[PDB]
Amino acid sequence: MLKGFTPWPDELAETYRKNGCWAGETFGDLLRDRAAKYGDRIAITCGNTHWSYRELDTRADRLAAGFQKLGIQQKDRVVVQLPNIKEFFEVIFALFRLGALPVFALPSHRSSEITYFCEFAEAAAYIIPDAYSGFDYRSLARQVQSKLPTLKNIIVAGEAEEFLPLEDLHTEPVKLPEVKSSDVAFLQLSGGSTGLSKLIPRTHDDYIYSLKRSVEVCWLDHSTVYLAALPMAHNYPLSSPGVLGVLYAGGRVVLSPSPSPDDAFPLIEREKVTITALVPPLAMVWMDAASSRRDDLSSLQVLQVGGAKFSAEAARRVKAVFGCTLQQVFGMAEGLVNYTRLDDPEEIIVNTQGKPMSPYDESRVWDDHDRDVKPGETGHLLTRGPYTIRGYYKAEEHNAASFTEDGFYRTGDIVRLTRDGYIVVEGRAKDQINRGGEKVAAEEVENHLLAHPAVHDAAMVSMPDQFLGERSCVFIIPRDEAPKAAELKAFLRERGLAAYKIPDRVEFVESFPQTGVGKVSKKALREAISEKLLAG
Ligand SMILES: Nc1ncnc2c1ncn2[C@@H]1O[C@H](COP(=O)(O)O)[C@@H](O)[C@H]1O
Numbered sequence: 001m002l003k004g005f006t007p008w009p010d011e012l013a014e015t016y017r018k019n020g021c022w023a024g025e026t027f028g029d030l031l032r033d034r035a036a037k038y039g040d041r042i043a044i045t046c047g048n049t050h051w052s053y054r055e056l057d058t059r060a061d062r063l064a065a066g067f068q069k070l071g072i073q074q075k076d077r078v079v080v081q082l083p084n085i086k087e088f089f090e091v092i093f094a095l096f097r098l099g100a101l102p103v104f105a106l107p108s109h110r111s112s113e114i115t116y117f118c119e120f121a122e123a124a125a126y127i128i129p130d131a132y133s134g135f136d137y138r139s140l141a142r143q144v145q146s147k148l149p150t151l152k153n154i155i156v157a158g159e160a161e162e163f164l165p166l167e168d169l170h171t172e173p174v175k176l177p178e179v180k181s182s183d184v185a186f187l188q189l190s191g192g193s194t195g196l197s198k199l200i201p202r203t204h205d206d207y208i209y210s211l212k213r214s215v216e217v218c219w220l221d222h223s224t225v226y227l228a229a230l231p232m233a234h235n236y237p238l239s240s241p242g243v244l245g246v247l248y249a250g251g252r253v254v255l256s257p258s259p260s261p262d263d264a265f266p267l268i269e270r271e272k273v274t275i276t277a278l279v280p281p282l283a284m285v286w287m288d289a290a291s292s293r294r295d296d297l298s299s300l301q302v303l304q305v306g307g308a309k310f311s312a313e314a315a316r317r318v319k320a321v322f323g324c325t326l327q328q329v330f331g332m333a334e335g336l337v338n339y340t341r342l343d344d345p346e347e348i349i350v351n352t353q354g355k356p357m358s359p360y361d362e363s364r365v366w367d368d369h370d371r372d373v374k375p376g377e378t379g380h381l382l383t384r385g386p387y388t389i390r391g392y393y394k395a396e397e398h399n400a401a402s403f404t405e406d407g408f409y410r411t412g413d414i415v416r417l418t419r420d421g422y423i424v425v426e427g428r429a430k431d432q433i434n435r436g437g438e439k440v441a442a443e444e445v446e447n448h449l450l451a452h453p454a455v456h457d458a459a460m461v462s463m464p465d466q467f468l469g470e471r472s473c474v475f476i477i478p479r480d481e482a483p484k485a486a487e488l489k490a491f492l493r494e495r496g497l498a499a500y501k502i503p504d505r506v507e508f509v510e511s512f513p514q515t516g517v518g519k520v521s522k523k524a525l526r527e528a529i530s531e532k533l534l535a536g
């Protein structure tokens, strides 16, 4: 038992293991296994380089030793902040075999966060690249050390300068400690904003299950060719199905330099990728490029889009722009992940956010009083299952206000279950606009606006107002020449939109504040408009 970990109920645990949900295998067993059923069947691609499963397997073994000689022991936490590169793999499976626990930080993090990540998780090691996307991470490290003189095992992929050169750790394999299929395998990082993040303990059993399923639902096989276009450490592109899921199904993963259609498209054409995943904001740009940039993306088959609702106005265009099957994906690091099945109608794909991936996923839409709302109603989404946590790392306070007494985790999202179980998300309860004592589902108004020839993307945020409590302020990224706020409102009015849903204010910008994985940060936008307001 890892300090801070909250297990599932004894009786419900057995259920899962007995119901073949928990395989009883580790990531060690996983890699050991696959690496031996198809040896040099390419597993990872970066530029011109290639890494056989078997190769990955080896390096892992070797690195594990080097890591162990470094002094890292079972259960030790090791924050890992690497971009989309081959090392990320050897590095995490090596820790997985050592029993160490990675802590998945994103490359966009900095001292404020990394110090917290290190201080909190009581990390025994920090892993970074010499530099990426123009940001030298050793300077960041130097920053963290300054605050954490104790952090003494800084490791670096590429020119390691004064710290520890990741390349020199590999050494002779050795006997490693028994890792139990039920041990916490790593610690993930909770959603973007509300402030500081929460850590998310996952275990070989609960996670790998979330992989085998996703694979089955996404149809991943040896033919699979996934293009990691988002920071892969993020749950979404790490397991839904993500790079790890891909490994599971003996397929091959292609690491892209950045999310830009500039790095991905040529890469898509060249490596002939068949599935990739974008968040909504990035999805718009991908589209815009998929015309104003002819170049063969025909290889593509499935194009995942999650992290936030993919407004109907845009989803409907996948088939036409990328000539493939769109897949809504509404998941979370806490567990539950919903997928529009590659089967079901075009409509279901274009107007819902899917339905749970596991038969054992339980989801209840309660109302402000934890009173199950009526059928098909809109309400607070709670969930519970095989790959859904029962508590955050060391956080008794948050856990009290996030997990019901019976294990249910409230996801803060507001949704309505449909006929077939499929979930149609409205948005985050805290993203709701309580204007003049009226509920305003932002997304709804946004979706309309995307339909305007001069709108590229849009994020409706609420803003203060002493008389109505809150007013509505929409941010618009012009699809060229910034339309007139009056023109947009008139547009909404013509479409028949309810007066109280029309944005009180329109604010034009070139891009929206985002987060680690790249989602728009409505929190951020809120701050923005609130400052402007104060400016007066
Ligand atoms: N497909 C989606 N549609 C609507 N909201 C989503 C979707 N995917 C992810 N999310 C949001 O992202 C959360 C999970 O992690 P985070 O973004 O870190 O708070 C969910 O609870 C949602 O609030």
Ligand SMILES: O=C(O)c1cccc(O)c1O
Pocket: 235, 236, 237, 239, 240, 306, 307, 308, 329, 330, 331, 332, 333, 337
């Ligand atoms: O983190 C998320 O919000 C997320 C989005 C899509 C799919 C996932 O698995 C996720 O964890």
